[model samples]
Target: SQEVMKNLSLNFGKALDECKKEMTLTDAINEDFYNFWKEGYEIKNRETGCAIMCLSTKLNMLDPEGNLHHGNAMEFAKKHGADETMAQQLIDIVHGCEKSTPANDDKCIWTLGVATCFKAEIHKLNWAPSMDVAVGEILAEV
Candidate 1:
């Protein structure tokens, strides 16, 4: 029957895995819903976008970030333009996090996707702070 499941990652949000002692046999998904994530450094804070995924195949869900949103911070940043070289360097970070990091894929990638629309507005803007803030708030829509 049910035995016990241990906490896998901090991102898991809480000790949900700790309580997952028993394995269930049902799953469902709401395809109609889409969660948009915040983009940028300080401007893009989490909790703005909705993270959609199958409760069972948590890791296999389709992330809008070209399928690289498996709780990998480096991947999250790289999807847009944070530096391809540095983005590549972050591969190992995600590998190590697998051991204990909860797998709630972050939505930062969506923010980047949203930011893509305002290339002109962002490319030439000297308002480093305001541009980023506006970008985040503007892009954060599901």
Candidate 2:
């Protein structure tokens, strides 16, 4: 464990001035959060406690008009294939292939964004909409 820290320091120190970096992916966000930031996802003062991390994964199932996509699959298929009837018929076929293939473009993953806001009473109400995925990165300067 100590050796790992030494190695990571050496590795990242090498990239202190580089632009492109080969990301070292790890599922150890808990570890990296503390190791890299020198603090865990919590903060404390003499008489108060503060949350140091906030995580959100946006569950995206929207269609072109920002409607919940329970039926837009057919339209997408038809538009892409340029044949409504053929595309309608191919829905099950496409879904079947995706279910069997690992490389299919049918990803249903969330768009995760992270934040840390220091406030006195965060749990008293809903957070600002700036916490959203697209909104977070742009308007977070506020």
Candidate 3:
């Protein structure tokens, strides 16, 4: 549902903001980066991927080895309004993406690859929410 995905994306943005500061990223991420799930959108900035990995760690969604922590991820999904089944499905997709994305020495690059794959899978399921609505909701909350 768009509602569920919107809530998730909104929370993700909050976490990303915190992570961006913590990592002291030099490059400013474009507003369009948040719309990665939109058709034809691509994430070219490696720093954005590093920020994502930082955000995942802050959320406790990554294991010590940097792979997805299924349990913690499931909890995160539920916290963002995904039901039990949807949470599990989301976890499954991430796990699969981790495996399918080609390995890279740079963890940030690898994380970005996995994220791209995850976005593609989410689009396939038509689960991505409009960035406009998601951002609007976040602004409204503030």
Q: Cα RMSD (Å) per model?
A: 16.1, 20.4, 3.6
Runs with alpha carbons beyond 4 Å of true place in candidate 2: 1-70, 77-82, 102-142
Q: lDDT of each model, Cα atoms only?
A: 0.30, 0.26, 0.71
* Candidate 3: tens digits of C-alpha lDDT, residues 31-56: 43445655755566788778778878
TM-score quality measure for candidate 2: 0.19
Candidate ranking under TM-score, highest first, comes to: 3, 1, 2
- lDDT tens string, model 2, 27-95? 223222222221224332211100111110122324443223434544433332434544443334334
Candidate 3 Cα errors over 4 Å, as ranges = 9-11, 26-33, 37-41, 129-131, 135-142
Best by lDDT: 3
lDDT of 2: 0.26
List the candidates' TM-scores in order.
0.22, 0.19, 0.79
Q: In terms of lDDT, which candidate is stronger, 2 or 3?
A: 3
In candidate 2, residue 3 scores what lDDT?
A: 27
